[PDB]
Amino acid sequence: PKIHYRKDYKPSGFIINQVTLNINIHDQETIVRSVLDMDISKHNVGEDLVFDGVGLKINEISINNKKLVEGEEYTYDNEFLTIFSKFVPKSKFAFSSEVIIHPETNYALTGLYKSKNIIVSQCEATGFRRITFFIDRPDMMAKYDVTVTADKEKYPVLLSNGDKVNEFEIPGGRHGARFNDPPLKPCYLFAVVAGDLKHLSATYITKYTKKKVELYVFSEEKYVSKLQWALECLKKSMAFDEDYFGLEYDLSRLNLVAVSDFNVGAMENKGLNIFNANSLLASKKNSIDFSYARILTVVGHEYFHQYTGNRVTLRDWFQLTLKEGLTVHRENLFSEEMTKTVTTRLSHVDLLRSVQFLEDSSPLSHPIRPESYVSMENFYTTTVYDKGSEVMRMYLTILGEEYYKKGFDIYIKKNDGNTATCEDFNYAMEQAYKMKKADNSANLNQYLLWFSQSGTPHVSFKYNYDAEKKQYSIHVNQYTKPDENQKEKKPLFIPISVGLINPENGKEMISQTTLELTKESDTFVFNNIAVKPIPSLFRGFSAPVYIEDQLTDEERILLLKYDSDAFVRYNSCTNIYMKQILMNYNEFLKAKNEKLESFQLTPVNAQFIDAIKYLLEDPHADAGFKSYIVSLPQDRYIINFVSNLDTDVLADTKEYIYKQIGDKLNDVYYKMFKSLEAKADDLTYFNDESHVDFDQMNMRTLRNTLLSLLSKAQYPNILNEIIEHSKSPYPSNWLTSLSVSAYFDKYFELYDKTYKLSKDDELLLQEWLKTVSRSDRKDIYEILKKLENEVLKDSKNPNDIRAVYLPFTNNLRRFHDISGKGYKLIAEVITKTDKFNPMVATQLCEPFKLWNKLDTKRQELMLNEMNTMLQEPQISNNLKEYLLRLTNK
Numbered sequence: 107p108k109i110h111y112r113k114d115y116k117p118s119g120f121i122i123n124q125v126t127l128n129i130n131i132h133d134q135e136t137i138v139r140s141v142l143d144m145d146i147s148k149h150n151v152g153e154d155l156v157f158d159g160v161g162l163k164i165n166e167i168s169i170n171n172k173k174l175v176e177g178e179e180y181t182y183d184n185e186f187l188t189i190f191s192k193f194v195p196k197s198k199f200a201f202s203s204e205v206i207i208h209p210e211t212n213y214a215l216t217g218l219y220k221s222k223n224i225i226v227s228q229c230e231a232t233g234f235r236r237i238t239f240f241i242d243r244p245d246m247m248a249k250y251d252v253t254v255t256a257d258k259e260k261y262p263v264l265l266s267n268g269d270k271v272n273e274f275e276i277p278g279g280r281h282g283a284r285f286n287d288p289p290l291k292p293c294y295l296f297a298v299v300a301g302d303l304k305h306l307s308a309t310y311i312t313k314y315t316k317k318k319v320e321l322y323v324f325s326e327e328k329y330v331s332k333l334q335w336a337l338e339c340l341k342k343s344m345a346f347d348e349d350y351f352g353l354e355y356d357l358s359r360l361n362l363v364a365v366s367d368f369n370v371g372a373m374e375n376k377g378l379n380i381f382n383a384n385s386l387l388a389s390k391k392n393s394i395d396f397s398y399a400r401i402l403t404v405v406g407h408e409y410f411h412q413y414t415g416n417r418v419t420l421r422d423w424f425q426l427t428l429k430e431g432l433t434v435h436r437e438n439l440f441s442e443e444m445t446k447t448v449t450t451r452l453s454h455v456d457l458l459r460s461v462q463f464l465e466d467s468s469p470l471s472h473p474i475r476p477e478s479y480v481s482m483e484n485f486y487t488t489t490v491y492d493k494g495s496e497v498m499r500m501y502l503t504i505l506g507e508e509y510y511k512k513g514f515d516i517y518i519k520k521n522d523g524n525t526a527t528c529e530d531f532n533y534a535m536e537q538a539y540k541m542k543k544a545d546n547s548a549n550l551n552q553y554l555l556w557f558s559q560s561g562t563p564h565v566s567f568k569y570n571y572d573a574e575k576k577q578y579s580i581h582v583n584q585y586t587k588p589d590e591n592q593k594e595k596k597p598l599f600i601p602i603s604v605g606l607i608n609p610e611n612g613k614e615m616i617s618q619t620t621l622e623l624t625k626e627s628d629t630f631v632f633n634n635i636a637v638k639p640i641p642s643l644f645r646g647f648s649a650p651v652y653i654e655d656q657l658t659d660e661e662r663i664l665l666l667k668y669d670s671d672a673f674v675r676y677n678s679c680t681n682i683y684m685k686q687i688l689m690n691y692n693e694f695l696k697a698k699n700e701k702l703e704s705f706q707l708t709p710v711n712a713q714f715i716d717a718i719k720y721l722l723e724d725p726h727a728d729a730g731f732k733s734y735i736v737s738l739p740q741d742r743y744i745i746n747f748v749s750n751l752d753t754d755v756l757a758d759t760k761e762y763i764y765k766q767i768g769d770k771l772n773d774v775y776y777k778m779f780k781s782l783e784a785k786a787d788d789l790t791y792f793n794d795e796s797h798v799d800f801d802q803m804n805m806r807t808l809r810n811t812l813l814s815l816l817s818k819a820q821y822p823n824i825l826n827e828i829i830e831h832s833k834s835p836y837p838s839n840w841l842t843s844l845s846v847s848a849y850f851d852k853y854f855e856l857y858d859k860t861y862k863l864s865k866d867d868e869l870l871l872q873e874w875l876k877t878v879s880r881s882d883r884k885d886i887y888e889i890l891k892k893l894e895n896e897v898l899k900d901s902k903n904p905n906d907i908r909a910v911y912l913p914f915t916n917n918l919r920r921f922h923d924i925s926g927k928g929y930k931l932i933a934e935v936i937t938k939t940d941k942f943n944p945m946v947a948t949q950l951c952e953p954f955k956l957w958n959k960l961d962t963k964r965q966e967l968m969l970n971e972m973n974t975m976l977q978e979p980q981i982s983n984n985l986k987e988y989l990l991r992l993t994n995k
């Protein structure tokens with residue numbers, strides 16, 4: 107397996123100036139004719155001409171209209187087409203080819219493939235070479251003129267990049283459309299779509315040049331009335347890039363297309379964005395609430411790529427975080443401003459500190475700009491995206507809004523229309539940093555370490571207050587654990603947004619302040635501090651670190667009640683829960699290890715329970731925030747703090763802590779579940795397809811969270827409430843009624859009722875499957891076998907496979923059954939899946955990422971299953987590289 111190294115980057119000895127494609131789609135085959143107008147570059151040294159081309163069936167290849175001869179003039183090995191240099195021209199020339207490919211049997215969903223009755227391409231990162239020969243790398247920029255033909259009845263709508271310049275009939279019931287896209291682009295941004303697509307459309311007029319832009323959103327006919335929210339999101343996304351960044355769309359039309367079979371999220375092909383149906387289609391009747399935020403996020407993200415990815419492009423795939431981390435950051439700024447709820451930021455932090463921190467302490471740990479890869483398919487990770495986003499957001503924290511905007515505009519102005527690397531971004535921000543500090547000797551060289559250093563920094567604190575001098579000191583230390591990528595970790599430039607809270611009245615004691623920690627340790631002193639403060643540290647989660655606040659639980663409760671920053675309140679709550687979890691886990695572990703016949707458990711802090719009740723009862727406090735405070739930290743966050751984690755002991759620890767709090771608060775929870783009904787479930791705008799209320803959906807989250815707490819607790823008569831909830835018009839509610847009924851005899855009755863409500867909408871059925879898969883059932887293994895036999899079957903749809911299996915892998919008691927049966931079951935599904943879709947097979951490996959964090963028995967059981975997968979003769983290259991790296995082999 108070939109290893110690609112970042113420092114080995116060299117420009118091609120060839121240039122491709124023009125691609126002219128003819129893609130003729132037939133019932134049993136698609137024929138692709140391509141002419142590349144090429145040249146020799148200044149880097150050329152008389153080498154062979156080598157094109158990528160994977161899985162292509164050659165009819166013929168030519169140079170300047172003469173056929174080449176296999177063996178004597180070229181070799182093709184199903185991966186690389188090599189033309190010996192003696193036959194390669196020394197000036198401008200045409201290379202032409204005709205190949206056959208088979209989208210109907212392309213179940214890997216890369217290249218050109220059939221999803222239900224739509225033909226669609228997916229080219230990022232290396233899928234264009236599955237369609238035709240190319241030097242398939244993003245620095246090869248070319249013009250594209252593309253013709254597509256097909257059966258007109260089956261494929262009436264034909265789309266590609268650029269302007270549609272000709273439409274024509276063809277004998278035999280066929281038709282054709284030609285699209286010409288003169289601006290240069292990399293091949294990964296090519297797309298084509300053919301299908302019987304229906305649409306909604308609108309015209310958008312840009313803010314400054316007043317250009318009319320036509321917006322089209324497409325799906326199959328069945329679901330066309332689920333497109334309205336996506337169109338509203340697209341308008342919002344355009345407005346926001348205009349408003350915050352001063353950036354307008356440059357083209358005359360933007361198409362969005364929903365397909366049923368897609369490998370996660372969406373894809374930013376220029377003017378032709380293609381989406382997983384689950385991230386474009388929603389209705390109030392047939393979608394859970396989460397779909398609304400998801401579509402806003404994904405439409406926004408693909409829109410924002412038009413500048414950060416499509417106009418300023420990547421030099422090579424090592425720079426992936428430059429488009430993805432920056433687009434995720436732009437996405438996050440947009441979602442925060444659109445939802446106006448503090449839970450939007452919290453949800454991003456919750457994801458990073460569970461999923462991405464687990465990655466970064468695993469054998470898979472990498473920096474956001476990796477140094478090498480085998481499969482670029484395995485580097486579209488939470489590290490590259492979500493830690494990359496936190497690195498891109500730290501420049502805004504460090505600079506502030508005015509100077510961040512100036513630096514960003516520097517980056518855009520200087521690199522628009524050209525390839526770029528992470529350095530070019532850092533350079534732009536530095537120029538803004540020089541301006542901000544008012545000193546041209548200031549630099550961000552140290553900041554570059556966020557791109558090259560792997561692992562999560564730990565930041566810890568000590569304090570000092572001198573009452574006579576009114577002088578307060580914060581002593582800060584940073585440390586990153588050595589790992590396989592750096593033996594010696596260096597200190598990072600860590601911005602620490604801080605406040606100082608007066609514990610007597612809850613007031614701010616200082617103005618906005620961001621500490622710039624640039625050494626291994628530093629002491630920040632503040633004078634004229636009239637009373638000893640409680641420090642509010644890392645406001646907004648201002649760096650992607652482990653925060654060790656060293657505060658007492660009394661101080662944490664005071665921040666939780668009285669601080670002004672949502673993250674710090676949520677984090678204080680999280681730190682109270684973690685101290686309790688680690689204490690009880692160790693008490694349970696000692697009792698299990700010592701086989702004790704009796705033992706004691708430390709109860710949950712009473713003043714902390716009181717603070718929760720105080721917040722829940724405040725009618726002016728935010729419902730989405732309340733749902734976070736009554737929830738323990740995610741299991742994947744907890745595991746970062748425990749060695750040899752026994753999953754049964756952790757399950758017993760969580761049970762204890764939830765029961766301790768419920769034994770005090772369940773009456774409060776029931777009262778609020780009832781008092782929240784009116785506003786949470788208000789149907790006033792149910793038939794208004796464009797009216798989306800994030801606060802109201804957070805009220806439903808809180809009700810559904812409280813309903814789960816009450817059901818687990820077997821609160822008196824709560825089944826009455828579960829049954830009534832099953833009758834709600836909102837799928838968030840009636841699917842919740844299914845999951846909480848797991849604890850009652852009524853579960854299979856609601857299973858049938860909710861299946862009936864779900865089975866006729868493809869996406870809603872997938873949400874039903876996730877609900878069943880995540881259900882806290884003692885008979886979950888029998889239930890999964892029933893889903894496999896009755897509903898899933900031999901579906902190759904990624905959404906169906908992921909819905910059936912991934913939520914189950916989060917079932918702490920049962921997936922981690924000590925027999926290893928859960929690990930065995932997922933390994934079988936991975937290997938089965940890998941035969942047709944190696945990307946999804948790799949996604950289904952996710953529970954294995956924490957294998958070396960668990961108790962020694964479960965470590966062995968997981969390792970056994972990974973080695974069994976590795977031993978499969980027919981293992982894919984993507985699955986093999988992934989499991990070798992995960993198992994340190």
Ligand SMILES: N=C(N)NCCC[C@H](N)P(=O)(O)O
Pocket residue numbers: 230231369370371372373374407408411430482483486
């Ligand atoms: N290899 C993959 N996971 N697919 C790449 C497509 C990712 C898109 N650029 P996005 O980040 O916009 O969803």
Ligand SMILES: [Mg+2]
Pocket residue numbers: 160161162163206207208
């Ligand atoms: Mg083939």
Ligand SMILES: [Mg+2]
Pocket residue numbers: 366868903
């Ligand atoms: Mg289907």
Ligand SMILES: [Zn+2]
Pocket residue numbers: 407411429430433
């Ligand atoms: Zn992206």
